[PDB]
């Protein structure tokens, strides 16, 4: 997604 960063 471009609106939110990846979660870890």
């Amino acid at each position: 997604a471009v609106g939110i960063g990846a979660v870890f």
Partner: antibody
Framework: QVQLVESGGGLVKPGGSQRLSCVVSGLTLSTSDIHWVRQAPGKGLEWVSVISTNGVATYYAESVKGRFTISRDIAKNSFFLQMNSLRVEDTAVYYC?????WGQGALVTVSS | DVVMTQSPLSLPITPGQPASISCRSSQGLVHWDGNTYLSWYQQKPGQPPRPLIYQVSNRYSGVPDRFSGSGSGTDFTLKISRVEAEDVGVYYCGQGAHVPPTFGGGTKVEIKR
């Protein structure tokens, strides 16, 4: 095109369970985490849960920890929110979303 | 959690006139990947949020160029250069840099006629 098709909304007694499903088409699921975000009637947006592209990392809003569980069946491009021990304050329209694209929403009403 | 403060809560406006909505975050919004994840959404009654702006200033496809986003650090602004009657609805900012993702409280844009 991208569509997130939701189902499973409805009326539940307090303490009951609902399962929401979200079928994703047209979205590359290897590069977008899948989230659930809810909106109580007349209120704003509140993030509920996330599952990572890797299918292992999950996180939850404090208000639903221990009660909600997010999961997926990647083979069917499907994502699920299992909502247990529901409370009246959980009443809301629930959206599955990757933040770029949003499902149509599913209303969950918790009432006696 | 990142607190997102939106201002004003209500914005009545005549079509053809400009509008400006402020969003202030309690922390910086730079993700590990280097991007700044501040988004703006438009929501009409009975519809899901429509994403208008991603990463501070980038319009999602098909969004009219009368919408523009700016800002940095903790201070951000959505501007509508000239409002149209179809812009009526509730606008939200949101951050996607820190878990949990959080949203502003909304600004209700009302059209004067």
């Amino acid at each position: 095109q991208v569509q997130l098709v939701e189902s499973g909304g409805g009326l539940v007694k307090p303490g009951g369970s609902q399962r929401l499903s979200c079928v994703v088409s047209g979205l590359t699921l290897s590069t977008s985490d899948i989230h659930w975000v809810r909106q109580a009637p007349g209120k704003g947006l509140e993030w509920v849960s996330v599952i990572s592209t890797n299918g292992v990392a999950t996180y939850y809003a404090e208000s639903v920890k221990g009660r909600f569980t997010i999961s997926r069946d990647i083979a069917k491009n499907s994502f699920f929110l299992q909502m247990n021990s529901l409370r009246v304050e959980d009443t809301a329209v629930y959206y599955c979303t990757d933040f770029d694209f949003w499902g149509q929403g599913a209303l969950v009403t918790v009432s006696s | 959690d990142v607190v997102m403060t939106q201002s004003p809560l209500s914005l009545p406006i005549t079509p053809g006139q400009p509008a400006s909505i402020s969003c202030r975050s309690s922390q910086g919004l730079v993700h590990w990947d280097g991007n700044t994840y501040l988004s703006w959404y438009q929501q009409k009654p009975g519809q899901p949020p429509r994403p208008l702006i991603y990463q501070v200033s980038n319009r999602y496809s098909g969004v009219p160029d009368r919408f523009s986003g700016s800002g940095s650090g903790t201070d951000f602004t959505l501007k509508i250069s000239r409002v149209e009657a179809e812009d009526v609805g509730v606008y939200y900012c949101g951050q996607g840099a820190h878990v949990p993702p959080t949203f502003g409280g909304g600004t209700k844009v009302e059209i004067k006629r």
